[PDB]
């Protein structure tokens, strides 16, 4: 069960090189990484 | 189950190289990254 | 359950080389890192 | 049983290089690092 | 229960190079790091 | 049973190399290092 | 003599009734009230 | 002679009622108000 | 002469009412209220 | 001659009612009120 | 000659009523009120 | 002559009513209150 809402999120990124995980603004929910 | 709503979200990237994972603004669900 | 709301967030991400995490400016939930 | 509202959060992250934990500006749940 | 209301943070990172534990601004839950 | 609110926190990080722990501006919850 | 470049801003504006100034996101110049 | 250059700039107004002045994000030059 | 460069700011208003001065999150140049 | 670089500022507003004066965020030149 | 740089400031405001004067988180130059 | 650099600043004003002076974070250069 999620609620979410009413978000104002703002994201500065620079310089971002050779990702391999994962860069996400807002997430809900799960992240796995191995 | 999921409830996401009313978000304002602006997202900067700059200098992106050889990007490999996941970059997503909003997200919602789930994220694998192997 | 999860009630997250009103949030405001800023994220300020500079020189992110070589990324095998998570960098998330807001997460709901659960982040698993193996 | 989360409830988290009305937040203003300011993230500066600089020369974030070789990440390979979990960097979030705000996160409501659960994270496990192996 | 977790009741996390009117929070105004700011977080300075710098210099933050090969991370591999949790770097969160505002953290609500629970944090497992082995 | 958890009632945080009203926090204002500044946090400043400097040479935060090799990070391996939790780094946390305010943390609610548990913390488990092992 | 301007020279204004490399900007980016984002303005959030919510509940703004009866505006009767000047409300601008960038403003380059010269700005008269009476 | 103005030279402004890489700026990023985040704005928040809430409950801007009424309002008779001047509310800019980033203004460069002059601001008269009688 | 002006030389104003690399600012990262974030600016939070909340409960503006009945402004008549003047409200700049940056400012370069000249301010004046009579 | 004015040289103002590499600025991270964070302001926080809260009940600003009936301004006549200046509120600024970060001002580079001159203020006068009268 | 000003030479002003690397500054990493935070303003916290809370009560501003009839403000008439200057508020301001970081002046480079001069002031004057009257 | 000004060199100002490297400051980490933080400001905490609560209940400013009525105010006609100056009221700054960080100021540089000189000012005037008549």
Same mark, same amino acid.
């Given at each position: +069960?999620?609620? *979410? @809402? @009413?978000?104002? =999120? *703002?994201?500065?990124?620079?310089? %971002? +090189?050779?990702?391999? /995980?994962? !860069? !996400? /603004? =807002?997430? %809900?929910? /799960? *992240? *796995? !990484?191995?």
């Amino acid at each position: +069960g999620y609620e *979410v @809402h @009413h978000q104002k =999120l *703002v994201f500065f990124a620079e310089x %971002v +090189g050779s990702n391999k /995980g994962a !860069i !996400i /603004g =807002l997430m %809900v929910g /799960g *992240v *796995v !990484i191995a």
